[PDB]
């Protein structure tokens, strides 16, 4: 009913002679190699709407038919989307058939209204000790994850997906906003092996929906893919009534993509160069993540800080919404401590005694004090000496080092490649376990007894086993066996070990090859549309 009027990059103007589509409505272009969905951005006047494309606009002709769907982008929601990968417009990109849609919901939605909001403030118990003590997660909150590569972020993502599904009974949505496709495939395959995503007949036992908008998608497709993740998580909140986790992987790339679609729509950029609507592009997304009377959405969203500048307007606008930060560090990760949550850098707004209670608060406030006093004397130890300083300053070092060990925890999703079983640690067992290390009920136990254990009922059961070990090392003996001709051959006997490698001078470079004959004549189209050589003179 509408026809393409202008194609300027990712921005399409289409023209409706009848009634115009509403702003944010979805338009489908009739007859195109890929399904091209346009989202109406503004009404330009003279019966023209300006649209941002969710796919490539190459091959688009002025006057192509464009059908109004009468609604915004509508995506499949429900339990049938669990364990599936879905793109921004709702199509399966996991190559496993159609998505069993319980309903199809508009991805554009106002935030839950004031009466629908919950006036209460409470902890999302995660089963991770360092997260439940030192930086608790608000149910319905937004959590910044300051990880990276090799700090075990993905195994922390899958452990949050695991423990929220197991304890609180809520599902998860992973919205990968502008992610590399190599990394989005890595998360898919690691979710398959760790059990949080299942394929085939047991698809319904999955705990996570993956909603992917990759980096090679146009900036409109990446700017809306976090709202497709919202809409899947809002069905579980409002219809299923659950406590949903939502992972917006790189909320900065949400900002960055929305900043590109404002620049393509001809809007004057704001301070440092973001869109003028930066606080309402974020606040439109972040306010749908809340607690209602039905259920909750809690968002763990990864935060990139541009140019290591916290006062940049993209993190500064994001940090107004964030209720906790979990900083994953490499320094904690090379000490073998997993998860690599920095116990001092990680912050929470939920960590004040009017909302978690004073018996929880003073433990976390006391644990952080012990770790802080230990790490400001590390230019006292290396400069002067270990046995230099006082016995009380050594009492903290012994207490902090078995606190710094006790923040480690083995994960249930990591046990398929680590052997150590997973430990869900309850909240009361975390506080009461850390009261004791703070006072000194376990100063006699070794520090590596406090390592990769569940709670304080398991620190005693690790110091018992290690202490005995000296009773069971007099079982056998230990010296050299047959110095270097036991099974260590000669080097020229090892050259004849080497297997045959067939090296072809041929490349095998014409497997199934067309080899079209290309002529260097210039071929054009005449006015019939018939292909013809280029006419001779101008």
């Amino acid at each position: 009913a509408g026809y393409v009027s202008q194609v300027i990059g990712p921005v399409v103007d289409v023209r409706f002679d009848g009634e115009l589509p509403s702003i944010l409505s979805s338009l489908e272009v009739e007859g195109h190699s890929v399904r091209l969905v346009l989202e109406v951005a503004q009404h330009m006047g003279d019966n023209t709407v300006r649209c941002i494309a969710m796919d490539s606009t190459d091959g688009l002709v002025r006057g192509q038919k464009v059908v109004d769907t009468g609604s915004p982008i509508k995506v499949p929601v429900g339990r049938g989307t669990l364990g599936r990968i879905m793109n921004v417009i709702g199509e399966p990109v996991d190559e496993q058939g159609p998505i069993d849609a319980a309903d199809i919901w508009s991805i554009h939605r106002e935030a839950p209204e004031f009466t629908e909001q919950s006036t209460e403030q409470e902890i999302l118990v995660t089963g991770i000790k360092v997260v439940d003590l030192l930086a608790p997660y608000q149910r319905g909150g937004k959590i910044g994850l300051f990880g990276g590569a090799g700090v075990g972020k993905t195994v922390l993502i899958m452990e949050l997906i695991n423990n929220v599904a197991k304890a609180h009974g809520g599902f998860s949505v992973f919205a990968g906003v502008g992610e590399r496709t190599r990394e989005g495939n890595d998360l898919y395959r690691e979710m398959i092996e760790s059990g949080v995503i299942k394929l085939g007949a047991e698809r319904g036992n999955s705990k996570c929906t993956l909603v992917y908008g990759q980096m090679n998608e146009p900036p409109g497709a990446r700017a809306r893919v976090a709202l497709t993740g919202l809409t899947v998580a809002e069905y579980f909140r409002d219809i299923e009534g659950q406590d949903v986790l939502l992972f917006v992987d790189n909320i900065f790339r949400f900002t960055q993509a929305n900043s590109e679609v404002s620049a393509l729509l001809g809007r004057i950029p704001s301070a440092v160069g973001y869109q003028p609507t930066l606080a309402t592009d974020l606040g439109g997304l972040q306010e749908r993540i809340t607690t209602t009377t039905k259920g909750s959405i809690t968002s763990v969203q990864a935060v990139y800080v541009p140019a290591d500048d916290l006062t940049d307007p993209a993190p500064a606008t994001t940090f107004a919404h964030l209720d906790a930060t979990t900083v994953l560090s490499r320094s904690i990760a090379e000490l073998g401590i997993y998860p690599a949550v920095d116990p001092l850098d990680s912050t929470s707004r939920m960590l004040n005694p009017n909302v978690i209670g004073a018996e929880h608060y003073n433990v976390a406030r006391g644990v952080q004090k012990v770790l802080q006093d230990y790490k400001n004397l590390q230019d006292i130890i290396a400069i002067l000496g270990m046995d230099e300083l006082s016995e009380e300053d050594k009492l903290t070092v012994a207490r902090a080092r078995k606190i710094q060990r006790f923040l480690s925890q083995p994960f249930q999703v990591a046990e398929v490649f680590t052997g150590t079983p997973g430990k869900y640690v309850d909240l009361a067992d975390t506080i009461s376990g850390f009261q004791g290390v703070l006072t000194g009920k376990y100063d006699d136990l070794p520090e590596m007894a406090f390592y990769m254990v569940g709670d304080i009922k398991e620190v005693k059961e690790k110091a018992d086993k290690m202490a005995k070990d000296i009773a069971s090392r007099k079982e056998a003996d230990n010296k050299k066996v047959s110095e270097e001709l036991k099974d260590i051959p000669s080097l020229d006997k090892l050259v004849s070990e080497i297997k045959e490698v067939v090296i072809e001078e041929d490349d095998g470079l014409e497997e199934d090859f067309k080899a079209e004959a290309l002529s260097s004549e210039t071929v054009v189209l005449n006015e019939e549309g018939k292909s013809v050589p280029l006419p001779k003179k101008n």
């Binding site: 900036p219 590109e260 404002s262």
Partner: protein, 71 residues
Amino acid sequence: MRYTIMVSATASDAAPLQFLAPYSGCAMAEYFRDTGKHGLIIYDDLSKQSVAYRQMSLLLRRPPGREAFPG
């Protein structure tokens, strides 16, 4: 050179031709990826491609962003 293609859009070439050369070099290199072999594509000065694309966009009166680059 018996394993190498060279796609060369030099300095005197038009800015559309330096914009399209990493893409046309990639399509030549995507032949080996798609037929089971292995490719190595090198876009030497990808920062010179973006300068050529900024030239086309400011001249097509597309709205500029940071350092006059497009959206």
